[PDB]
């Protein structure tokens, strides 16, 4: 019943590969549905064509700012930022998919993919999914990050949508 979504990643416009995610709608339905709808584009806006603007090797890849492309933008499907749904799921290791935010109850569209265990984020960011296939593609993306997060090549979501 949990939905599956995919990203087709490109690097300076050249195809890299596909990452797919299980979204934990059984656990965090409002948060999963936001990410699912933004990935299909069915509200008229979403992730297609956006970039991963902040990548820190050994930590995480952050994206989802489809508005301002730099970490200052993005919006949810709900017409305003929305609440932290629950913190049932924890940041256990690589592949965890979690919401970026600007403090309590400020979820929009920005998310990150962990490339390590990041337990110090438990209770601050809502975990809502995990990489299902293509963790190797996230590992390839990670190599274009840097210590302060600036990417050395443009990492883009060339296409995205819902599988199955």
Curated annotation (Swiss-Prot):
Q: Write out the PTM section of this UniProt entry.
A: Acetylation at Lys-124 markedly inhibits catalysis of cis to trans isomerization and stabilizes cis rather than trans forms of the HIV-1 capsid. PPIA acetylation also antagonizes the immunosuppressive effects of cyclosporine by inhibiting the sequential steps of cyclosporine binding and calcineurin inhibition. Acetylation at Lys-124 favors its interaction with TARDBP.
Q: Tell me where it resides.
A: Cytoplasm; Secreted; Nucleus
Query: What's a BP term from Gene Ontology annotated to this protein?
Result: cellular response to oxidative stress
Assigned protein family: Belongs to the cyclophilin-type PPIase family. PPIase A subfamily.
Q: Where is this cross-link: Glycyl lysine isopeptide (Lys-Gly) (interchain with G-Cter in ubiquitin)?
A: 27
* Residue(s) of cross-link: Glycyl lysine isopeptide (Lys-Gly) (interchain with G-Cter in SUMO2): 27, 81
Q: Which GO terms describe its cellular component?
A: cytoplasm; cytosol; extracellular exosome; extracellular region; extracellular space; ficolin-1-rich granule lumen; focal adhesion; membrane
Residues modified to N-acetylvaline: 1
Q: What is the effect of changing residue 124 to R?
A: Loss of acetylation and interaction with TARDBP
Q: Which domain of life is it from?
A: Eukaryota
Effect on the protein upon substituting residue 120 to E: Loss of peptidyl-prolyl cis-trans isomerase activity
- What residues are glycosylation sites in this protein? 107
Upon changing residue 59 to A, the result is: Loss of ability to stimulate MAPK/ERK phosphorylation
Name of the protein in question: Peptidyl-prolyl cis-trans isomerase A
Which residues are recorded as modified (N6-acetyllysine)? 27, 43, 75, 81, 124, 130, 132
Activity: how regulated:
Binds cyclosporin A (CsA). CsA mediates some of its effects via an inhibitory action on PPIase.
Per its database record, what is this protein's job? Catalyzes the cis-trans isomerization of proline imidic peptide bonds in oligopeptides. Exerts a strong chemotactic effect on leukocytes partly through activation of one of its membrane receptors BSG/CD147, initiating a signaling cascade that culminates in MAPK/ERK activation. Activates endothelial cells (ECs) in a pro-inflammatory manner by stimulating activation of NF-kappa-B and ERK, JNK and p38 MAP-kinases and by inducing expression of adhesion molecules including SELE and VCAM1. (Microbial infection) May act as a mediator between human SARS coronavirus nucleoprotein and BSG/CD147 in the process of invasion of host cells by the virus.
- The PPIase cyclophilin-type domain sits at 6-162
The protein's matches in CDD domains, at most eight in alphabetical order, are given as: cyclophilin_ABH_like (cd01926)
Which InterPro entries does the entry link to? Cyclophilin-like_dom_sf, Cyclophilin-type_PPIase, Cyclophilin-type_PPIase_CS, Cyclophilin-type_PPIase_dom
What is the protein's quaternary organization? Interacts with protein phosphatase PPP3CA/calcineurin A. Interacts with PRPF19 isoform 2 (via N-terminus). Interacts with isoform 2 of BSG/CD147. Interacts with FOXO1; the interaction promotes FOXO1 dephosphorylation, nuclear accumulation and transcriptional activity. Interacts with integrin ITGA2B:ITGB3; the interaction is ROS and peptidyl-prolyl cis-trans isomerase (PPIase) activity-dependent and is increased in the presence of thrombin. Interacts with MAP3K5.
């Amino acid at each position: 019943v949990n939905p599956t979504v995919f990203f087709d990643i490109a690097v300076d416009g050249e195809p890299l590969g596909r990452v797919s995610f299980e979204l934990f709608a059984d656990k965090v339905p409002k948060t999963a549905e936001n990410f699912r709808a933004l990935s299909t584009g069915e509200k008229g806006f979403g992730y297609k064509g956006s970039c991963f603007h902040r990548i820190i090797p050994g930590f995480m890849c952050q994206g989802g700012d489809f508005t301002r492309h730099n970490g200052t933008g993005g919006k949810s499907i709900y017409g305003e930022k929305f609440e932290d749904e629950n913190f049932i799921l924890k940041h256990t290791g690589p592949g965890i998919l979690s919401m970026a935010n600007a403090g309590p109850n400020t979820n929009g569209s920005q998310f990150f993919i962990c490339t390590a265990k990041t337990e110090w984020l438990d209770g601050k960011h809502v975990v809502f999914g995990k990489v299902k296939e293509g963790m190797n593609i996230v590992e390839a993306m990670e190599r274009f990050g840097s210590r302060n997060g600036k990417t050395s090549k443009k990492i883009t979501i060339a296409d995205c949508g819902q599988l199955e």
